[PDB]
């Protein structure tokens, strides 16, 4: 019975490809060719955060655009103050192999996880002033790659078992699951409406899911290698993905087709992180060539190059107000660009 | 010159820095190893012998000659080491266990070894090879019902080296078989590396304890190699 299922699936995907191609009347390069370029953009290292013992693997900005969180492979989460360069908090972890971290929008909780298959959530504001483990969500069979907060009692996690999950922090039980991927989910990205989220797997594919339904809303393909990081557009109708083929791909949610591509002959290294600015004109991407590149989202041109790291760039983040950009590499150092 | 909150935050940051400096002394004195190996290799016996001194990763801490060694072994991973293998790029050594008694997996073990030796992020990490279950291989090659040339044609042209120094009272056929199995991994390893890391093959039988010493010595040599790169002596 599989013989007819295969041909049915292939004719369905051919029909989908034809319906997607029928809507492609003009490329984005043909629409924004008359737009003046952004010129040359140069940024300098404003501050350098040191203190980590092992390589830095994760980093996320808060809602106040002042505090920052970083995760090191020695089993340490460090919350820094970006304005005063002082260390606000230091939390030791149970497992040293942490691969992701998250900061709650209210600033009360901090989530982390990794090769221990357990998502540890710590509380920052305690009655005694000391940071303690608030909860340990277990149940996954693979390593955790990314986690993001929806609210004070809901957390979206991505594991290496080709599935994503949404957990209730107040209860501790898995609220819902998202299945369908054929590879390890590598990154997550929440929409501004906190109702849709994209997740890319190690199969050159990504899927947009709805939080309130738990079913696959949309699927996107086009890459040639595994996708490592995905970032949503500020408007909520587009998203950029980066893979190991040294090429970024910006898709839109309404047209369901590859909209923009970013590549160069002198770039043959993998991509580790992607992020947008407030306006959405600049796209920052960290590569394995020890440097980061800021491309023009509307013209696919190299607008700027940020160098200064001695090892592979691991994480890159942009503040909510777009004032500074945090970069973290395997050199155990954090850099602030502006 | 500053408010009370500012100096309080400065004192808190200084205390956090002192705590980090105190933890660094304990962190830098512990050697971290990564244990790798497929099924039916004998990793459980090795770890249960070394412990005499849904979890994700199993951690085994043991002290040898006042030196602390923490070995991390893979747990509930779904047999996909393409992505999470990069997190172990700063380990001291990778102890790779290979079952030399099962021929049908030996070549597969090669496919598991070479990819590790030619990894882009594992070019500066030493690999200690443990060929486990030597008695099973010995009894199999003495039984005469399993021919190695059926899976490796070059074994038909392989001979015992002149510098062979086996243990007193060992069969020459089992010695030639063990030396061929070791030379396979040696040729796979020496194909690249450029002297950045060396492979240390060892013959274990999962019923001996001195292996726990061997690794130690090997680790020492690894550190020695690091010293050779610090003083610009090589």
């Amino acid at each position, epitope marked *: 019975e599989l013989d007819q299922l295969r041909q049915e699936a292939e004719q369905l995907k051919n029909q989908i490809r034809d319906a997607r191609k029928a809507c492609a009347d003009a490329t984005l390069s043909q629409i924004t060719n008359n737009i003046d370029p952004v010129g040359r953009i140069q940024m300098r290292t404003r501050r350098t955060l040191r203190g980590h013992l092992a390589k830095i693997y994760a980093m996320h900005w808060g809602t106040d655009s002042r505090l920052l969180v970083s995760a090191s492979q020695d089993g340490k989460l460090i919350i820094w103050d970006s304005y005063t360069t002082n260390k606000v908090h230091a939390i030791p972890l149970r497992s040293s192999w942490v691969m992701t971290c998250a900061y709650a929008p209210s600033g009360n909780y901090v989530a982390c996880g990794g090769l221990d298959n357990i998502c540890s959530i710590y509380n920052l504001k305690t009655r005694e002033g000391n940071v303690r483990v608030s909860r340990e969500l277990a149940g996954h069979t693979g390593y955790l790659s990314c986690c993001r907060f929806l609210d004070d009692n809901q957390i979206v996690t991505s594991s290496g078992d080709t599935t994503c999950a949404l957990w209730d922090i107040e209860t501790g039980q898995q609220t819902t699951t998202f299945t369908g991927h054929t590879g390890d989910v590598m990154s997550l990205s929440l929409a501004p409406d906190t109702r849709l989220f994209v997740s890319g797997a190690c199969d050159a594919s990504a899927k947009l899911w709805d939080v309130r339904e738990g079913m696959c809303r949309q699927t996107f393909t086009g890459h040639e290698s595994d996708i490592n990081a995905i970032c949503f557009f500020p408007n909520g109708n587009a998203f950029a993905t980066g893979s190991d083929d040294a090429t970024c791909r910006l898709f839109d949610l309404r047209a369901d087709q590859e909209l923009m591509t970013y590549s160069h002959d002198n770039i*043959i290294c993998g991509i580790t992180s992607v992020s947008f600015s407030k306006s959405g004109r600049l796209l920052l991407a960290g590569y394995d060539d020890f440097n980061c590149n800021v491309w023009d989202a509307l013209k696919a041109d190299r607008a700027g190059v940020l160098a200064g790291h001695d090892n592979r760039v691991s994480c890159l983040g942009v503040t909510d107000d777009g004032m500074a950009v945090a970069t973290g590499s395997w050199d155990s150092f954090l850099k602030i660009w502006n | 010159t500053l408010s009370a909150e500012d100096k309080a935050a400065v004192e808190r940051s200084k205390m956090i820095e002192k705590q980090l400096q105190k933890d660094k002394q304990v962190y830098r004195r512990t050697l971290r190893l990564l244990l790798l190996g497929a099924d039916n290799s004998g990793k459980s016996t090795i770890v249960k012998q070394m412990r005499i001194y849904t979890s994700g990763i199993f951690e085994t801490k043991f002290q040898v000659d006042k030196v602390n060694f923490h070995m991390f072994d893979v747990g509930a991973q779904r047999d996909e080491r393409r992505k999470w293998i990069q997190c172990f790029n700063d380990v001291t050594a990778i102890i790779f266990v290979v079952d030399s008694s099962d021929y049908n997996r030996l*070549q597969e073990a090669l496919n598991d070894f070479k990819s590790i030796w030619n990894n882009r992020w594992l070019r500066t990490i030493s690999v200690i090879l443990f060929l486990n279950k030597q008695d099973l291989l010995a009894e199999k090659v003495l039984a005469g019902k399993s021919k190695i040339e059926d899976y490796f044609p070059e074994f038909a042209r392989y001979t015992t080296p002149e510098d062979a120094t086996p243990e007193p009272g060992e069969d020459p056929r089992v010695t030639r078989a063990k030396y061929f199995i070791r030379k396979e991994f040696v040729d796979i390893s020496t194909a690249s590396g450029d002297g950045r890391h060396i492979c240390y093959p060892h013959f274990t039988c999962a019923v001996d304890t001195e292996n726990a010493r061997r690794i130690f010595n090997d680790c020492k040599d690894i550190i020695l190699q690091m010293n050779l790169r610090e003083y610009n002596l090589v």
Partner: nanobody
Amino acid sequence: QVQLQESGGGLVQPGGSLRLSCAASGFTFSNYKMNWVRQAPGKGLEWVSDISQSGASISYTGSVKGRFTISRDNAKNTLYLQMNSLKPEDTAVYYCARCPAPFTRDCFDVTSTTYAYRGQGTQVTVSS
């Protein structure tokens, strides 16, 4: 999408020859290392051969040395595998696998049970 279509299988007599063809689509074929893997009925996945991007550094497993030969044509993006002197123990499903990362010398998880960058495979039966 990464598509790898295999063809050229079927049932043949022992001692014959076959020519398996692997057609790639959706990526640059001249930049990824290719391999041919085998899965026996009732057994696990066993790697057979592999070839790099340019066409050199070809390697085979010990059980197929001297009998199978793999080549690649980048002008048409095709992977050919000529199989001579077939034995009755070679009846199995052949898969055309691709290297996960380009411009590399190491390809991990090419023999995984649920690897994504592989085709459906072709059946090769060797009997009367």
